[model samples]
Target chain A: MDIDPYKEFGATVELLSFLPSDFFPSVRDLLDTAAALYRDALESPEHCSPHHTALRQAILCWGDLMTLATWVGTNLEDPASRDLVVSYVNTNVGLKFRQLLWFHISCLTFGRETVLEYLVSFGVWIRTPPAARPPNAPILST
Target chain B: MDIDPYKEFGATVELLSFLPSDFFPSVRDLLDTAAALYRDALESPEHCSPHHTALRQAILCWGDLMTLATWVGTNLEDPASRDLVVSYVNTNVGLKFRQLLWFHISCLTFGRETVLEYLVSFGVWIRTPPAARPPNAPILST
Candidate 1:
């Protein structure tokens, strides 16, 4: 896909992430659907493009970011959940996080109306790196 | 954390992933607790080491792997869930999966009893690369 739509995607997501619940639902469906469409496109030999496939992959990864970040942070109020989340980031959520994050940046930069609509729909909480907040939120790998 | 009995950390996890039900409970407690300990480590400035802080982050991330993998692969039989699993592998599972896989190979190379116990415990379904069996089963991710 052309990368022109999202220039401030990161900044936009960072802004939206301030509210987890609202932010999650807003972008989740759209990015996920887009990702699925891309996956389908990859399935078609005529429409096969590694770039689209990769973006879809990245988007899916981003979708999980919400679930992992939100559920682990708030829903899982115990050690097991914490370990699950920690190990998750360690074992998974690595490059894919970056790839998806890049897409968010791209989409957000240019897709402001779409991105903004999603960001404005929620309340901020201490769950899951604020989606893009915490500035240095633990977006690291082991 | 008080470095546990098993010194070669990687080898042990390989052994555990083999027996899903058993392994889930065993290290489930320890890994989860340790993750909590690490998170607690971050709460105290003086008591914290950058190493511990980082490990805590990894521990939390790893924490979510099994649940997400199992649920997405088995529990959620919808397009959204499918998209989640597909995307997760594309980005996060790649290296971590490889790291774990390599360890499985390493332990299996020399340690048969423990590995076998784990390998034989389950029917090779939707977990840990089926301990490398059943030929035609879905490899799912690269």
Candidate 2:
């Protein structure tokens, strides 16, 4: 809302490369941009190639997404507190589906538990927001 | 808000099974419940089982998520006017990342465009809601 999200996001990435900090904007942008690349690739199959390149690009995208989880409890996810947080943990809902699908890349990836290793050490499970569930759905959990 | 989301969701699923319709609730519930499966499975990876089952399950999930797309330009996506909507299409934006990530499963299994075909005749890009994201975040999805 301040400067355009993309420009501000871009600036954060450039500034953070040397700055070395989470700086909400930087992480949000990285998650966003990396996600954009994956999105572009998904729409354009011609670019995916031997599945090897697509797998790499896919992992990188997931890594960025999963890393956003690290910022979860860091206050980056508090939308009301700070308007720019990237909502990593919440993204987990969909991330898992992506992970499930990406898991096949085993043919193409991380060990079972190491799925999103980039975000694992940060404790994605602990920081995960927890149970924003739907109706009568079984509580099938990890 | 007036009634339970799940019960209403279930009721719709039942009604739609026989009636050929795209009523918002049917699509919304389809997307929501199938995604709920992805959410639950993500947390408990212990059951991923044979790669084949996981892959099939994953494809089914994406198919449901994708089929919600045919409603895209249908005006059913807009939540204001009539009242019986389910909030599926409105669930985009964030769906994009999930769509992008899961889109790859086709490479590993389903024959390319055949991906969502497991669900739709058209395409739904999946932009996804921010907080409504899983792994425990809030159900901010509308």
Candidate 3:
């Protein structure tokens, strides 16, 4: 059976926009759909389809950018948010997602060592507010 | 002093082509961003002035969908990639991003029944493999 791969895949892509970010309680519901789509393409080797291949490639490239962009968007916008994320990951350590995120942050923040350090310090501040106001804080020195 | 509320808050929304199922690495990065965005919005109310309220609300509503759409795109296009993502999130229990994703799937799959039961059950299935699987087992059977 010759399937118009793009048509099939595009339909799924269109549905993607409609998916709720807070997709119910079932993680499986989300994971299953993704897994099922991928499995179908791989299992049906006869359909070593070019369209499928192209779609896969696109996903890979897009995923990379999306991931990096998410990291940058989050960290740049809010320090407390970044700390909370890091803390959550730290609590759920050893997970692939956590490790992957750490790697992404490292890669994104590599050159900006000073900025990264400041973020780390900011995280500390979030966890334990400093009693002594730093020079940066608004205060009139007596 | 009059300030453009929008100026006080920076907002950006990104749309990427479908991502691979193994897009967990990328998803993790994006989740960090989501968390960061949420945390910043919560912690720094001053920064998120009344003007920024609309932007913040929009982010809250659509940010998860954006990420999920990217995930679906990757899996729909490539089967193997799907497995990779499921595996990552399944292991990382309590990850806020994954939970948010699950919540979304629950809503999509069962509409209103996006509660804890559905989420746990769905999570179980995501980790399980079907009887007949591809070498690069990508798909998840419902």
Candidate 4:
């Protein structure tokens, strides 16, 4: 399937626009760096995130990486888009932090193995990306 | 792609096995109903949730519906998943209620048009199926 650069751009813009005003400078810098890295990596397959390398490699041949970079950069500069990104980030960060904390505490008390086993068996119903994973699978190392 | 019935069965079993004893009955009943309906709908394409018609349609074709239903049912039974859903629902409901109250007060103080304008510009991001929407458009109805 062809990756739509504009959709990616819009999504990235929406996510970045949701940050607090005070955080914009830092986030903007991060986005810039990420975009640069993404572009460089796309040009040569060696630089992609290992987890996503296969997907990225597939897309590189189908779409222009530089076009995606330009679209993302331009959209990020728009005030409305930026605001949306900030809001998206704030909401997601808040939700994710709570989720991670809950999971961490539950795992700590019950033991990660037990909790994960339960999740694999029963947590599939509510969790996104339904657990197709094997029990006691090796962790994805950096 | 060929749909794996074994995966569906496995997911369902995994979800059921993960439930804490207290929540099992309700979750099990829901899953039973869902599984029955899924089979009927797949065979005849008649029974399913009206509110989730788009999702139902996808499920019918992909048979991934069982996986999703199983996953959601499992989460409902698990404490951590239950807590996450409750937290998300509570937060959103509270925020929406507050926004509605603000609009009511604004209408009384600032006049209808001013309040309406504020409401028009108030955007909230909702995750919905891509087939059901064009990206970035305001949702008029579910």
What tens-digit string does per-residue lDDT give for candidate 2 at A1-142? Answer: 0111112111221321231122113333433443454445433323233232323333333343344333322523344523222332324334332432333232223333342333333333334445743323221122
Q: How well does candidate 1 score on lDDT at residue B131? A: 56
**TM-score of model number 1:** 0.24
User: All models: lDDT?
Assistant: 0.39, 0.31, 0.38, 0.36
Q: Give the TM-score of candidate 4.
A: 0.19
What lDDT tens digits, residue by residue, belong to model 4 across residues B1-142? Answer: 9553224212222222232222212222233323422334534556433323432443343335335544675768677876675465435433332333333223333454554443343222123355664444331111
Name the candidate, 1 or 2, with the larger lDDT value.
1
For every model in order, the TM-score on chain A comes to 0.32, 0.26, 0.28, 0.26
Specify the highest-lDDT model's number. 1
User: Model 2 in CAPRI terms: which quality?
Assistant: incorrect
**Model 4 stretches with alpha carbons more than 4 Å out:** A1-80, A85-142, B1-22, B25-142
Off by over 4 Å in 2: A1-25, A31-142, B1-28, B31-43, B46-142
Find the candidate with the highest TM-score and give its number.
1
Lowest summed lDDT across 10 adjacent residues in model 2 chain A is found at A1-10
The alpha-carbon lDDT assigned to residue B60 of candidate 1 equals 34
Scored against the true structure, residue A111 in model 1 reaches a CA lDDT of 57
Over the true interface, candidate 1 deviates by an RMSD, in Å, of 18.0
Q: lDDT tens digits, residues A1-142, model 1?
A: 1111122122323453354332232344545445444434423333133233334334433444555456434634467755665655534444335434444443433453554444443232245455666644221121
The residue ranges of model 3 lying beyond 4 angstroms of the native Cα positions read A1-47, A70-142, B1-142
Prediction RMSDs, each to the true structure:
17.5, 19.8, 25.8, 23.0
Which 10 consecutive residues of model 4 chain B have the lowest summed lDDT? B19-28
